[PDB]
């Protein structure tokens, strides 16, 4: 009967280790409790373990077992403590973020935010996650707000490895909506300070890619190709940033009058985007480029309609100027759709 608060204690320690991401402590307590949980009959403790194991499963990036576990815990969500509901919503949020559905992820993370706000609970990483989703959702001001709120907490307990990522998000924030030089100073200091970390290559790849985009937008494509390749030689493992990087480099080469070469790269990204179901947002996008260049016809409209269906938009204006050759009247409705996008 006194064992209950001891097991709950070690569960709180595992939670603490999961928040600080102390993988050593995480694994240690994991194998300390996974075998000691055999004599637990209390529903609360069992659900705590089951919910912490979801975050532990997030650490392993096993989206399948995570989704299945959450599906198992969805039926028993009704009897959950508000904090347990918090953990569940958070887990589902990161689950949706791992499947690159940043909208749903944003939903669950916002619900997690208000739930954490009610209980007086505070995880600094949550604000960073929400902010990340916001940056994924075509640069928001809420991205800046949330990376700031995350920075205020990260500096409080010395999590610099997260701070640098926040600074990257800020640099992107200055990048897409505003001027580029300040963002270039940002990325410069980032490069000058990322060499002290034990994971330099990822930061350098991301930074170099974003700087490449900065150049491409600003000008001097020949200056952009160098950075793009310099990031590509560091990326190694395939992810979203890789596909986006090859899309960007292809976007540079097509304006550099290299043409067909870029297409090969596009293909190199197309087949690689068919391997995962989460790469769709890039996959179709790549396709949207291909059909745009080597397949200039009416089929373009139909395909980009078929892509307009799931992608809930740079298309509308393009279809509008594509409607410029024929009848006029029906056009401005797409413009009003742009307006509704602005609203």
């Amino acid at each position: 009967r006194d064992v209950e608060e001891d097991v709950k204690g070690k569960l709180d320690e595992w939670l603490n280790a999961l928040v600080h991401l102390d993988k050593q402590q995480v694994e240690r307590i994991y194998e300390e409790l996974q075998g000691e949980m055999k004599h637990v009959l209390d529903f609360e403790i069992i659900n705590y373990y089951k919910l912490l194991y979801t975050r532990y499963l997030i650490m392993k990036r096993d989206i399948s077992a995570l989704e299945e576990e959450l599906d198992k815990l969805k039926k028993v969500y009704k009897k959950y403590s508000p904090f347990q509901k918090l953990l569940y919503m958070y887990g589902r949020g990161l689950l949706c973020c791992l499947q690159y559905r940043w909208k749903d992820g944003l939903d669950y993370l916002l619900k997690t935010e208000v739930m954490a706000k009610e209980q007086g609970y505070h995880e600094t990483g949550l604000y960073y996650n929400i902010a990340l989703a916001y940056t994924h959702l075509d640069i928001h001001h809420l991205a800046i707000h949330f990376v700031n709120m995350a920075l205020e907490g990260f500096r409080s307990e010395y999590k610099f490895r997260n701070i640098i990522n926040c600074q990257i998000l800020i640099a992107v924030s200055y990048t897409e909506k505003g001027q580029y030089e300040e963002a270039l100073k940002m990325y410069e200091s980032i490069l000058r300070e990322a060499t002290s970390f034990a994971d330099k290559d990822v930061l350098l790849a991301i930074t170099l890619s974003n700087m490449g985009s900065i150049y491409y937008k600003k000008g001097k494509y020949q200056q952009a190709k160098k950075y793009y390749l310099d990031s590509l030689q560091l990326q190694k493992q395939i992810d979203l940033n890789y596909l986006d990087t090859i899309y960007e480099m292809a976007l540079v080469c097509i304006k550099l009058e290299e043409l067909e070469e870029a297409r090969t790269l596009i293909d190199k990204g197309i087949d690689a985007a068919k391997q995962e179901e989460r790469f769709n947002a890039k996959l179709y996008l790549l396709l949207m480029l291909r059909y745009k260049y080597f397949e200039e016809a009416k089929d373009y409209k139909a395909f980009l309609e078929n892509e307009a269906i799931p992608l809930y938009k740079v298309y509308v204006e393009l279809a509008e100027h594509f409607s410029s050759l024929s009848r006029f009247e029906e056009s401005n409705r797409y413009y009003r759709l742009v307006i509704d996008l602005m609203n």
């Binding site: 973020c97 991301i206 990087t245």
Partner: peptide, 8 residues
């Protein structure tokens, strides 16, 4: 653009 990975 390239955005960092989540926390976890």
């Amino acid at each position: 653009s390239s955005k960092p990975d989540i926390v976890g």
